[PDB]
Amino acid sequence: QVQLVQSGAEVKKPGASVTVSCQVSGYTLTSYGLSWVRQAPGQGLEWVGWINTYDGQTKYVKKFQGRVTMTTHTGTNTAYMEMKSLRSDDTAVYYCARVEGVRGVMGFHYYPMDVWGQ
Amino acid sequence: HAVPNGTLVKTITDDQIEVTNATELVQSSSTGKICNNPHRILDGIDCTLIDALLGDPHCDVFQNETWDLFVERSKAFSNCYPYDVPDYASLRSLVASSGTLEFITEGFTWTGVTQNGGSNACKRGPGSGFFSRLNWLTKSGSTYPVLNVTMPNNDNFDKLYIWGVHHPSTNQEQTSLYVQASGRVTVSTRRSQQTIIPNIGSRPWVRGLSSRISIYWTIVKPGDVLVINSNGNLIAPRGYFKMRTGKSSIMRSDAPIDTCISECITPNGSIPNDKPFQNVNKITYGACPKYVKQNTLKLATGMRNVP
Amino acid sequence: HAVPNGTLVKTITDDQIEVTNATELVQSSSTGKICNNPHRILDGIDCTLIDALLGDPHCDVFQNETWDLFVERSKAFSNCYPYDVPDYASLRSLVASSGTLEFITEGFTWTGVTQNGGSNACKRGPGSGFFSRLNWLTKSGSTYPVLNVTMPNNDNFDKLYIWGVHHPSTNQEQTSLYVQASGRVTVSTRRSQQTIIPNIGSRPWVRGLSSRISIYWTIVKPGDVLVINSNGNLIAPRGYFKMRTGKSSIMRSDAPIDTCISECITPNGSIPNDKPFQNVNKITYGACPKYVKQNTLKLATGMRNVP
Amino acid sequence: HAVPNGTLVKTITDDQIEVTNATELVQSSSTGKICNNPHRILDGIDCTLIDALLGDPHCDVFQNETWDLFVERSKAFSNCYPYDVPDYASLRSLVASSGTLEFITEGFTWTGVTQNGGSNACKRGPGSGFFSRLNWLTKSGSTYPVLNVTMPNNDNFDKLYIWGVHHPSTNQEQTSLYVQASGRVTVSTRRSQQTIIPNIGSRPWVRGLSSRISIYWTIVKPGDVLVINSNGNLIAPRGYFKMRTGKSSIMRSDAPIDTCISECITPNGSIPNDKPFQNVNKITYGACPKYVKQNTLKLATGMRNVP
Amino acid sequence: NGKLNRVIEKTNEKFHQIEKEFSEVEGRIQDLEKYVEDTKIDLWSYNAELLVALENQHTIDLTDSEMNKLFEKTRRQ
Amino acid sequence: NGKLNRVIEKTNEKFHQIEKEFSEVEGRIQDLEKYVEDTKIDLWSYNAELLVALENQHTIDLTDSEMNKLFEKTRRQ
Amino acid sequence: NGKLNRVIEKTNEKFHQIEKEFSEVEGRIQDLEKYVEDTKIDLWSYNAELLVALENQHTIDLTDSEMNKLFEKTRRQ
Ligand SMILES: *[C@@H]1O[C@H](CO)[C@@H](O[C@@H]2O[C@H](CO)[C@@H](O[C@@H]3O[C@H](CO[C@H]4O[C@H](CO[C@H]5O[C@H](CO)[C@@H](O)[C@H](O)[C@@H]5O[C@H]5O[C@H](CO)[C@@H](O)[C@H](O)[C@@H]5O)[C@@H](O)[C@H](O[C@H]5O[C@H](CO)[C@@H](O)[C@H](O)[C@@H]5O)[C@@H]4O)[C@@H](O)[C@H](O[C@H]4O[C@H](CO)[C@@H](O)[C@H](O)[C@@H]4O)[C@@H]3O)[C@H](O)[C@H]2NC(C)=O)[C@H](O)[C@H]1NC(C)=O
Ligand SMILES: *[C@@H]1O[C@H](CO)[C@@H](O[C@@H]2O[C@H](CO)[C@@H](O[C@@H]3O[C@H](CO[C@H]4O[C@H](CO)[C@@H](O)[C@H](O)[C@@H]4O)[C@@H](O)[C@H](O[C@H]4O[C@H](CO)[C@@H](O)[C@H](O)[C@@H]4O)[C@@H]3O)[C@H](O)[C@H]2NC(C)=O)[C@H](O)[C@H]1NC(C)=O
Ligand SMILES: *[C@@H]1O[C@H](CO)[C@@H](O[C@@H]2O[C@H](CO)[C@@H](O[C@@H]3O[C@H](CO[C@H]4O[C@H](CO)[C@@H](O)[C@H](O)[C@@H]4O)[C@@H](O)[C@H](O[C@H]4O[C@H](CO)[C@@H](O)[C@H](O)[C@@H]4O)[C@@H]3O)[C@H](O)[C@H]2NC(C)=O)[C@H](O)[C@H]1NC(C)=O
Ligand SMILES: *[C@@H]1O[C@H](CO)[C@@H](O[C@@H]2O[C@H](CO)[C@@H](O[C@@H]3O[C@H](CO[C@H]4O[C@H](CO)[C@@H](O)[C@H](O)[C@@H]4O)[C@@H](O)[C@H](O[C@H]4O[C@H](CO)[C@@H](O)[C@H](O)[C@@H]4O)[C@@H]3O)[C@H](O)[C@H]2NC(C)=O)[C@H](O)[C@H]1NC(C)=O
Ligand SMILES: *[C@@H]1O[C@H](CO)[C@@H](O[C@@H]2O[C@H](CO)[C@@H](O)[C@H](O)[C@H]2NC(C)=O)[C@H](O)[C@H]1NC(C)=O
Ligand SMILES: *[C@@H]1O[C@H](CO)[C@@H](O[C@@H]2O[C@H](CO)[C@@H](O)[C@H](O)[C@H]2NC(C)=O)[C@H](O)[C@H]1NC(C)=O
Ligand SMILES: *[C@@H]1O[C@H](CO)[C@@H](O[C@@H]2O[C@H](CO)[C@@H](O)[C@H](O)[C@H]2NC(C)=O)[C@H](O)[C@H]1NC(C)=O
Ligand SMILES: *[C@@H]1O[C@H](CO)[C@@H](O)[C@H](O)[C@H]1NC(C)=O
Ligand SMILES: *[C@@H]1O[C@H](CO)[C@@H](O)[C@H](O)[C@H]1NC(C)=O
Ligand SMILES: *[C@@H]1O[C@H](CO)[C@@H](O)[C@H](O)[C@H]1NC(C)=O
Ligand SMILES: *[C@@H]1O[C@H](CO)[C@@H](O)[C@H](O)[C@H]1NC(C)=O
Ligand SMILES: *[C@@H]1O[C@H](CO)[C@@H](O)[C@H](O)[C@H]1NC(C)=O
Ligand SMILES: *[C@@H]1O[C@H](CO)[C@@H](O)[C@H](O)[C@H]1NC(C)=O
């Protein structure tokens, strides 16, 4: 079984920073890249970014450049996405999804997000 | 004759000089996919080369496969008995260069031992299993005779025998599987020999077990003989892998295989080889341009641009 | 325009042709001193890298040091327990490339053994001592239990564990220190294992002893686990060295460190990197000119000299 | 001026252009024989380098030989006790580079063992023999004391000691030759040690035997000491080979040695070094032209040919 | 045309080579492989740079000479 | 000026390399390291020699052409 | 004359090198030796090709200039 278990719900104040964590299980984190996808409540999915575990190279949307940072703690098979300078528009559900390609190619160009966190 | 806009190139005596027309010499972009022609590509889904070699259950689809380039995905994992390959890189390199997993089953006469030993960590079908290309010999009844078997190489190709030594976790398990307190394995040929003394000790818990398998290989040249002499802790081979010579190789890349024509394959995909130099990757297969550090090299194809 | 005296250069079609002004392209002389900027130089006085790593007493000044280039003097010597490092070059290379001796002490639970064993050949202070980064476990009372300890790597950096195996000289000493007649050491991780069978035999007299220490290392990647299983002759680690990646390296040179600015350091000292080629030494560190065999290469910087 | 027929050369901007006179730059043919001057050639008839080193009977003519290039024929064979050299390539390389088989017999004091052991597979003269540069120590009477001997290196040249470990085929033979059930060998110096545990097991039948000899070497630097500590299965050295530094090397070639003058020797024979590039072979000895892949390279030595 | 056919005869065809990416840290052999690959890459990068510079120099010299010659001849006619 | 900036872009910056001096005799690996270093040194020495020769040739050709042109023009004036 | 004396100073004198022919299959070290030798051979083949091309180019340019100059001077006389 491949599972992604995310942090608990966070309640913040505008201008603060939040950190959402994604704990993988059933596979090694460095084998798969990890995409982050947000969904404002009733506004459909919106792609946030992509962390390439095993080399740390990231790719965010221009809308989120600078104010979003993705890191991977390989020891605990955990991945963190922190958002600084929160706004009101950022209230949403955040999902970490597993993408296949880490070596040679950027995974999200050619592969889907087969496994999603809650 | 002149043109409105021009390209800046570099010469012996000029950092930048404008010319009418200039071409690029460095191929710095890749299509992102691996063309499956003309090179016989083998996509290894969830299977490393060694796992397919040993006969990992979820790799049973790779039996008797051949390839011109084995693409080994980053998602590959092992789901069988926790093994360990001393000199892993050498074994992987020579297996990949051989270019075939063609396995010929040989008749080995193991007398007084229980063949086809299996484990619950390597589940084949619904029940316990093992590597398909290895044979776990355990004590039969209450004795474990000193196995001493032989196989002559009468064919004119190299034979590759993959065997292993079982390191148990606890002395009780050692004496329960092999009555000798501390056995050993010795696989020898006319020209060389190799002896292993299995050790007993707890190891990091992997897939429910603390025991391990150490995987060794032996290459029997034509006209040579293999002699396997063990008194415990032997993971015997079932046959031999037909070694070869060719243009085969292996590559670690997550690029998806695609239906097209291309000669040069890098981990970033297939790239055209029209240009003499490339900047995509330093790992290449096939007729590839020479890797260079520069991302651009302009070759002047026209006269000096004086507009 | 012409000049009275000229310099002889060499072209495609001429062995020697005189020109007005010619420059040199090969830096063939060194200042003789090593500039201590901008590269963080570490002068190792009387201490080899491995000696500072293990914690040789007269190297206690090097604890928790970091460097961009470790200069290892030719006068260095060891003045502790006579040790021996199989694959010495690899360990030295990777320690030097890590670039830090930062040692984090971990809590190891050794039950039933006497820790902090020492010897008179390695005199710390006035009394007997040992390497500061190792722990000599001996029998406690009259028994030596099979040590089986573990440490998980929960941080996201590699850990380097340095351990050792004690080869005694005489069987009496073996049974006096470790009640087992012939113990062994096994340090293993999820991906690899390493087992050593200590031997008993007299060896060349070094610093008053015939026994030896064999120094081994194990690198625990993030998320991995270390398991140490021994029943005698174990020189346990006390903690781990924080591995890193950087531009660090090591050099053997007796040149004295000096207060100045220079980018290219050779064993003959710091040399300027204005010229593209150098003839001083083939061992270099930093932005150095490419080593060439020729001692002179004249570049013409003027017109042909016809006086 | 022009000529009737011309040679086609290649330039930067022309695939083929005819010129009056053109020379060749690639030496693509060999005389087929190896000139025996000025390089001191040693023709090894039926003897490999290691066989002459150990003292194979049919190689007794090679004792105390020296060479600048050891030519090792493809017809060479071994006709003595079946041996095996772990790290064979390294030993062969360093022996060949040393450039001399000069063997100095040292006085070793083996007490309580029967020296000069021999076998029928290695027939010296009419009777059983052994390698001339090794000493097979067997039990004397009914005991085999733990040999512990030493030799200091008081000279200022390296000493090369060649020793070996005897692997018997059957436990009965083990206890008949060496009373210990399972002995070991340990050859050590101040800086390094090397221990071997002989194993007992049947091996492929070679020259009437199933037992083997494992050949190891130890280099004692000046001022160092050798200590040999064994309790069975020891093939002791008789002395040391005087190591050296020089321009010596080894080559595998069946070309016949000939009386002539030449500086560059390839396995295809001696070739002239007038031309800068050669295409004969990539294995060379002496002042040889640089190997290239092209079989022809035309250098224009005249003006463009317009007839 | 391409003009490099004469200098680089073709793209040589390499199939099996050393490892150029390593996961763990081995020591001597890994350092040797890294050094060999880096040496090869530096030498080929330099060769490419020099070859491009030479080809550009000779091409511009040739075209400049042709332009000047044609200008002189047309002016004289 | 220096004129070599175009051909050799800069002094590349190497930090950790193989051992190039050995005390004892190991065998295969030491010979491989010695061979690799010697190969690199020979190739770079040749490259340096050829580069200097080419630069000298082109510099003298250029200056000679300029001298001859200026002499002709001044003589004609 | 030979004309290559300036570029290649002499035939360098190599005595002991790595093995370049192997009987069995070892693995990492054999592959490294094969790769090193192949790299050296490719680099030297390229260097030889480029050197020959450059020498041919400069020789033909020089002889062509001399022929043209002598034709013009003889025609003018
Ligand atoms: C073709 O495919 C290849 C293969 O994917 C592509 O190669 C990749 O290309 C990208 C983009 O160009 C590179 O990313 C860039 O990296 C620089 C700096 O990189 C340096 O570190 C790299 C990674 O090091 C980690 O990983 C290696 C290998 O796993 C490991 O050994 C290291 O120790 C280190 O490990 C750490 O991270 C792990 C993962 O989190 C942890 O587990 C571990 O514990 C450590 O914490 C390294 O690869 C790189 O280059 C080395 O290797 C290449 C060979 O690939 C070699 O050529 C070099 O000489 C080096 O030896 C460097 O050492 C980074 O700064 C860049 O960041 C830019 O962008 C960000 C935001 O986007 C900005 O904030 C930055 O300021 C900067 O602008 C960028 O991330 C990637 O390194 C490279 N290689 C790999 C293996 O991915 C190639 O690009 C493709 N080409 C085409 C045309 O498609
Ligand atoms: C020598 O020393 C080593 C190291 O201390 C010992 O190795 C440990 O041995 C114990 C048992 O012998 C192992 O415990 C088992 O761990 C399994 C893995 O658990 C990890 O992963 C799960 C998720 O998969 C996490 O929830 C958990 O926290 C761990 O991170 C467990 O799955 C096992 O559970 C089974 O047994 C327990 C027993 O009560 C049941 O309750 C469960 O339902 C289940 O049936 C078990 O907990 C431990 O993992 C080993 N560690 C390592 C590093 O290998 C040796 O035992 C010791 N040997 C001797 C002779 O002293
Ligand atoms: C197996 O075989 C080996 C080799 O033969 C034996 O090793 C020798 O063991 C003996 C004692 O066991 C060693 O003798 C000791 O040598 C020390 C070093 O001396 C050298 O250096 C000093 C200067 O520092 C010189 O003056 C001297 O000539 C040597 O060159 C001495 O310092 C020791 O002296 C101590 O003991 C003597 C004993 O009477 C006292 O008089 C002294 O005051 C002092 O307390 C001692 O002489 C010898 O060095 C070992 N040789 C090697 C090469 O290691 C093994 O013992 C043997 N083992 C078995 C089981 O048989
Ligand atoms: C463990 O297992 C191994 C492998 O099975 C056994 O090794 C074999 O041992 C037997 C005897 O112990 C060996 O038999 C001997 O073979 C010699 C070689 O024969 C080959 O070459 C000749 C030509 O030279 C051919 O004609 C022949 O067909 C073979 O190809 C023979 O020369 C020997 O003959 C001598 O003994 C016989 C015995 O009757 C006499 O008749 C003869 O006149 C002569 O005196 C003998 O036949 C066999 O070669 C071994 N095989 C290998 C591969 O090594 C181990 O014995 C076994 N050990 C244990 C403890 O079980
Ligand atoms: C510069 O030269 C290139 C090389 O031929 C020209 O590119 C080609 O242009 C033709 C136009 O007839 C196309 O059919 C080819 O497909 C082009 N090839 C490539 C590789 O691009 C380019 O047009 C020239 N530019 C100028 C301004 O003359
Ligand atoms: C040849 O050229 C060199 C390079 O510039 C000259 O050396 C410099 O000369 C100036 C004189 O104004 C000094 O200030 C610089 O410090 C010199 N630099 C170096 C690196 O030496 C040299 O003078 C020239 N020689 C002739 C005869 O013209
Ligand atoms: C082209 O040049 C070569 C090089 O000198 C000439 O070959 C030599 O010719 C002379 C004739 O006087 C002989 O004595 C030499 O032995 C020749 N040397 C070699 C290496 O062949 C050749 O004759 C010239 N050809 C033409 C047509 O001029
Ligand atoms: C072509 O010339 C135009 C102006 O004439 C300029 O803006 C442009 O950058 C040049 N290059 C291309 C590719 O359009
Ligand atoms: C593989 O091929 C061999 C002979 O080529 C054959 O004996 C064997 O049955 C084959 N195995 C499978 C699974 O096809
Ligand atoms: C300069 O010219 C003088 C003679 O005019 C000569 O003696 C000297 O060697 C030349 N070079 C230098 C550096 O003085
Ligand atoms: C070295 O540093 C570690 C942590 O960085 C610290 O725990 C330790 O006490 C330090 N040791 C010394 C001698 O400063
Ligand atoms: C020389 O010219 C003749 C014809 O004049 C031609 O047949 C021949 O091939 C040319 N070359 C040689 C080496 O004779
Ligand atoms: C070989 O030379 C050594 C000394 O150089 C000498 O003692 C020995 O007797 C010689 N052996 C033979 C066979 O000449």
PDB file of N, CA, C and O in Angstrom, chain D residues 79-99:
ATOM      1  N   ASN D  79      53.513 -26.019 -15.727  1.00  0.00           N
ATOM      2  CA  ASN D  79      53.675 -27.456 -15.573  1.00  0.00           C
ATOM      3  C   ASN D  79      54.158 -27.785 -14.176  1.00  0.00           C
ATOM      4  O   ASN D  79      55.082 -28.581 -13.989  1.00  0.00           O
ATOM      5  N   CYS D  80      53.536 -27.177 -13.172  1.00  0.00           N
ATOM      6  CA  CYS D  80      53.905 -27.379 -11.781  1.00  0.00           C
ATOM      7  C   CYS D  80      52.629 -27.453 -10.957  1.00  0.00           C
ATOM      8  O   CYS D  80      51.533 -27.634 -11.493  1.00  0.00           O
ATOM      9  N   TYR D  81      52.780 -27.323  -9.648  1.00  0.00           N
ATOM     10  CA  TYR D  81      51.649 -27.418  -8.744  1.00  0.00           C
ATOM     11  C   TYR D  81      50.592 -26.386  -9.121  1.00  0.00           C
ATOM     12  O   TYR D  81      50.927 -25.218  -9.334  1.00  0.00           O
ATOM     13  N   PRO D  82      49.326 -26.775  -9.230  1.00  0.00           N
ATOM     14  CA  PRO D  82      48.296 -25.823  -9.655  1.00  0.00           C
ATOM     15  C   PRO D  82      48.132 -24.713  -8.635  1.00  0.00           C
ATOM     16  O   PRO D  82      47.691 -24.941  -7.512  1.00  0.00           O
ATOM     17  N   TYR D  83      48.490 -23.505  -9.033  1.00  0.00           N
ATOM     18  CA  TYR D  83      48.445 -22.362  -8.142  1.00  0.00           C
ATOM     19  C   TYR D  83      47.408 -21.363  -8.627  1.00  0.00           C
ATOM     20  O   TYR D  83      46.816 -21.509  -9.693  1.00  0.00           O
ATOM     21  N   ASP D  84      47.208 -20.332  -7.820  1.00  0.00           N
ATOM     22  CA  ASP D  84      46.219 -19.307  -8.094  1.00  0.00           C
ATOM     23  C   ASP D  84      46.668 -18.031  -7.409  1.00  0.00           C
ATOM     24  O   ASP D  84      47.017 -18.055  -6.230  1.00  0.00           O
ATOM     25  N   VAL D  85      46.650 -16.926  -8.135  1.00  0.00           N
ATOM     26  CA  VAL D  85      47.142 -15.654  -7.632  1.00  0.00           C
ATOM     27  C   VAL D  85      45.975 -14.687  -7.534  1.00  0.00           C
ATOM     28  O   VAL D  85      45.548 -14.111  -8.534  1.00  0.00           O
ATOM     29  N   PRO D  86      45.424 -14.484  -6.342  1.00  0.00           N
ATOM     30  CA  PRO D  86      44.503 -13.364  -6.151  1.00  0.00           C
ATOM     31  C   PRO D  86      45.224 -12.064  -6.457  1.00  0.00           C
ATOM     32  O   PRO D  86      46.382 -11.880  -6.082  1.00  0.00           O
ATOM     33  N   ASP D  87      44.530 -11.159  -7.137  1.00  0.00           N
ATOM     34  CA  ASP D  87      45.157  -9.961  -7.688  1.00  0.00           C
ATOM     35  C   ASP D  87      46.360 -10.338  -8.545  1.00  0.00           C
ATOM     36  O   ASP D  87      47.481  -9.887  -8.321  1.00  0.00           O
ATOM     37  N   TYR D  88      46.118 -11.206  -9.522  1.00  0.00           N
ATOM     38  CA  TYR D  88      47.187 -11.643 -10.408  1.00  0.00           C
ATOM     39  C   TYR D  88      47.726 -10.482 -11.221  1.00  0.00           C
ATOM     40  O   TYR D  88      48.940 -10.355 -11.406  1.00  0.00           O
ATOM     41  N   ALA D  89      46.837  -9.628 -11.719  1.00  0.00           N
ATOM     42  CA  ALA D  89      47.265  -8.545 -12.590  1.00  0.00           C
ATOM     43  C   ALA D  89      48.191  -7.586 -11.864  1.00  0.00           C
ATOM     44  O   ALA D  89      49.186  -7.132 -12.431  1.00  0.00           O
ATOM     45  N   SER D  90      47.884  -7.262 -10.610  1.00  0.00           N
ATOM     46  CA  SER D  90      48.732  -6.340  -9.866  1.00  0.00           C
ATOM     47  C   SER D  90      50.115  -6.923  -9.637  1.00  0.00           C
ATOM     48  O   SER D  90      51.126  -6.231  -9.805  1.00  0.00           O
ATOM     49  N   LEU D  91      50.185  -8.191  -9.237  1.00  0.00           N
ATOM     50  CA  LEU D  91      51.485  -8.806  -9.012  1.00  0.00           C
ATOM     51  C   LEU D  91      52.289  -8.856 -10.294  1.00  0.00           C
ATOM     52  O   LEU D  91      53.476  -8.519 -10.299  1.00  0.00           O
ATOM     53  N   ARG D  92      51.659  -9.265 -11.390  1.00  0.00           N
ATOM     54  CA  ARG D  92      52.369  -9.319 -12.656  1.00  0.00           C
ATOM     55  C   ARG D  92      52.850  -7.940 -13.064  1.00  0.00           C
ATOM     56  O   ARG D  92      53.988  -7.778 -13.510  1.00  0.00           O
ATOM     57  N   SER D  93      52.006  -6.927 -12.894  1.00  0.00           N
ATOM     58  CA  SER D  93      52.385  -5.578 -13.283  1.00  0.00           C
ATOM     59  C   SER D  93      53.583  -5.092 -12.487  1.00  0.00           C
ATOM     60  O   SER D  93      54.542  -4.563 -13.056  1.00  0.00           O
ATOM     61  N   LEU D  94      53.559  -5.273 -11.167  1.00  0.00           N
ATOM     62  CA  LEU D  94      54.655  -4.723 -10.379  1.00  0.00           C
ATOM     63  C   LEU D  94      55.932  -5.521 -10.574  1.00  0.00           C
ATOM     64  O   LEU D  94      57.022  -4.941 -10.576  1.00  0.00           O
ATOM     65  N   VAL D  95      55.834  -6.837 -10.746  1.00  0.00           N
ATOM     66  CA  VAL D  95      57.031  -7.613 -11.036  1.00  0.00           C
ATOM     67  C   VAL D  95      57.631  -7.183 -12.361  1.00  0.00           C
ATOM     68  O   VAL D  95      58.845  -6.992 -12.473  1.00  0.00           O
ATOM     69  N   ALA D  96      56.795  -7.011 -13.384  1.00  0.00           N
ATOM     70  CA  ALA D  96      57.297  -6.597 -14.684  1.00  0.00           C
ATOM     71  C   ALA D  96      57.934  -5.223 -14.616  1.00  0.00           C
ATOM     72  O   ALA D  96      58.970  -4.983 -15.239  1.00  0.00           O
ATOM     73  N   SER D  97      57.324  -4.301 -13.874  1.00  0.00           N
ATOM     74  CA  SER D  97      57.898  -2.968 -13.759  1.00  0.00           C
ATOM     75  C   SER D  97      59.194  -2.977 -12.967  1.00  0.00           C
ATOM     76  O   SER D  97      60.063  -2.135 -13.204  1.00  0.00           O
ATOM     77  N   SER D  98      59.343  -3.902 -12.020  1.00  0.00           N
ATOM     78  CA  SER D  98      60.597  -3.975 -11.284  1.00  0.00           C
ATOM     79  C   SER D  98      61.754  -4.277 -12.221  1.00  0.00           C
ATOM     80  O   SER D  98      62.823  -3.671 -12.114  1.00  0.00           O
ATOM     81  N   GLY D  99      61.556  -5.196 -13.153  1.00  0.00           N
ATOM     82  CA  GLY D  99      62.544  -5.425 -14.181  1.00  0.00           C
ATOM     83  C   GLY D  99      63.673  -6.347 -13.816  1.00  0.00           C
ATOM     84  O   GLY D  99      64.693  -6.353 -14.506  1.00  0.00           O
TER      85      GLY D  99
END
